[PDB]
Symmetry: D2
Subunit: 247 residues, 4 copies
């Protein structure tokens, strides 16, 4: 289709929104490389690769801890060597540590900032060197980057709003090559990080414009749109897929 002949790199592709993104981009015809960290995700990841090869797509699963900048850079470099320069980079892997402000530890701080901020920045730096003209960079942000709404999300909210300025700076840095950079903001999305049946799920739905959690395909479709022909003129933008959480 419209991604035929293109290479996509997706951090966190083993499950949740990232697995939905890799499936959607592969269906659009991209060759896919994606990362995972947890040892418990190794089986899921190699099964995911087998599912994509069975559809005739090239695919690689790469273990790379986003907490470690060297591991993210190596993953991209390995992806480039095996599939070629990356056309679509999707920074999706994330961590959510929430709680009373006085209990936040330095490990909470370094871990959140390395995974949610520095890793996307390192993947971009590694990928951009050889990204073909008209390339795409798509960061997964969060509705909490633009509105905290509640107590207990200060550190997470700061890591995710760091991507706003990073994305706008990237759209300026790379626009002369036709490369676009956008950040997508999910509202509540039914995944393991945020189950739709969690005890907190109900008070959250109460503040949405649409009275329900979204689904992982909602995010994958926004990403597929920014990745394809229809995204060519969208850049530097914050695109909320949040059910009207912000309205």
């Amino acid at each position: 289709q419209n991604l035929n002949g293109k290479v996509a790199f997706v951090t966190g592709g083993s499950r949740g929104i990232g697995a939905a993104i890799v499936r959607r981009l592969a269906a659009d015809g991209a060759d896919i490389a994606f990362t995972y960290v947890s040892a418990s995700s190794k089986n899921v990841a190699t099964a995911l690769v087998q599912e994509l090869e069975a559809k005739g797509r090239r695919a690689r699963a790469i273990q790379a801890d986003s907490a470690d900048p060297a591991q993210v850079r190596q993953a991209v470099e390995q992806a480039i060597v095996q599939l070629g320069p990356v056309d679509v980079l999707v920074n999706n892997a994330g961590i959510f540590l929430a709680g009373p402000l006085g209990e936040v530890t330095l490990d909470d701080y370094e871990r959140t900032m390395n995974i949610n901020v520095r890793a996307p920045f390192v993947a971009i730096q590694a990928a951009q060197a050889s990204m073909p003209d008209g390339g795409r960079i798509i960061n997964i942000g969060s509705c909490l980057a633009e509105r905290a709404g509640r107590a207990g999300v200060t550190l997470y909210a700061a890591s995710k709003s760091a991507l706003l300025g990073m994305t706008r700076g990237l759209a300026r840095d790379l626009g002369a090559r036709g490369i676009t950079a956008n950040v997508v903001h999910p509202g509540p999305i039914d995944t393991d990080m945020n189950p739709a049946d969690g005890e907190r799920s109900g008070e959250l739905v109460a503040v949405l414009s649409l009275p329900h959690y979204g689904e992982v395909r909602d995010i994958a479709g926004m990403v597929a749109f920014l990745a394809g022909p229809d995204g060519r003129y969208v850049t530097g933008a914050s695109l909320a897929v949040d059910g009207g959480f912000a309205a």
Copy 2:
């Protein structure tokens, strides 16, 4: 066909961005009704309708001056009886009157607010009474709504930023019915109203992230995405298709 069996209504569908939207939504399978104002556009408008019928879509062109609240309301009422309840309402017709602040007249003001603000609001009121659950409302705004950037556009920017609160409030009003309301913000788009080769065009390209005007298909593609299945959880959002004018 992502829009098969749906009805779409589009103000200002005879040329420019509005024409590209009607072609795109019909090509996605929607029956289309759209408005035009000048008698000079009557030929172009009815040629457009036969072009869609020749592709097997039902389509109707209705002459309705956006300045007149009854004409817009009657235009929507006519489309509902001829094509059925509208699933996709696209408020696109607009006027751009620019110049020194001291030279602004009351006719400039009433004409700008009647066309850019009141006409969409009237069209939404007529369409919403019978819009099926899961429907879509899409206002065409402007990058000048979020950043004026220059002298001489105060009246126009006020009329477009008026769609921001209107859209967010509509998302809340209609969200229990699954209906979404979004505003898309064009950057410079090569049209009759904004030619890519106008004498001021170069200084506008100079402040962009991507160094060229966009094209009418770029706005149409965003509209088609919000109109379809992948837009189902986007609501109350402002979506820039501006080449990074805002980055």
Copy 3:
């Protein structure tokens, strides 16, 4: 006395937030002219003039229905004849019509748009020609301009988000003369229009960062800061005085 020798114009200065603005600006040394609409307010307004003159300030009370553009223009012109060119223009008078979207009437729309949008533009257009270099324009917006948050405020929200684009275009139109233009956004404020003890008031406090309504001096203080020496480099900004409603 940072406003000594300056003239202020305040729509709606007879009560609520506008009465607090005229009091605060006069205490800073401004000669003041302000408008009222209700004949029932003539006693409060002329009482307000008497209180200011007893403090040695020049003051004028001018009846001007904001629904009528001509009355606003003539009020500004009279203030100018009486006190000299206005240094500080404060657009405060406003109307709040809320309710179900299907019950909005054209009278609701016309009255809301004339009072909340056209009247400020007309006052600015009257005052700007002879506004001294370094003057100030301050529009009173609302937190609902940036976030509707709930159903029933669509029309009001659109009227208020119209001031964002108008204010940013004015900051461009007039900045070469040193004139600033800003919009202030009250959060819930205890006044006649929004009593703190209304039966609906409690659910609103529940979404604030500070757990209470604000007070009219909170807006008056923000206005005084913009009017005076510390505001000289602030222009085109949206300033929330909303108790953290948007946070």
Copy 4:
């Protein structure tokens, strides 16, 4: 003296914007503690302290590299013991590293994020434990957090937009104690880091609404406003003092 009897903490208080803040908050009557990093600033820092003591204020200058979390925490703890619990915390010290995206180094990343993001978070965590009810947190951000405008500022813009989410979450975390948290975004301000006569200054003045750089008093005045009685209902806000750079 609206800050009488209160204690203020200001990182980077020896010169530029931070010195003007320490002078303004002391002149409003606060006892002040502030940090510096360079051994070369030790004379300037202790001279500033003597200037404040000569006006009758208590003041302490503490060398503390913001890059080092323990030094930042230690400085806040030392000031709490010496001057008492902090009422007004001003995170001002910052670093600007600009250049091509591909040349950004690990040290550029680590130093920018440790200084612009982590140090403010650490100062806040230390001060908030004993901050008196009704206190104020004021982060110094940048107009580049909200709009990059140009190529070459990606890292810096990411570090500053991180303060947006941090500030909004802090406002929720602390609002129940009456504490406010806001970010001030300077435009170009004539200092050592951004001299008003630099070769790049003219093209920058060309994109402003006011056609000149601001001055350090313009920033000190907005902080003093936030710190005082008139800021009591402002929280979670982004307040631009940018000459209309964003208009």
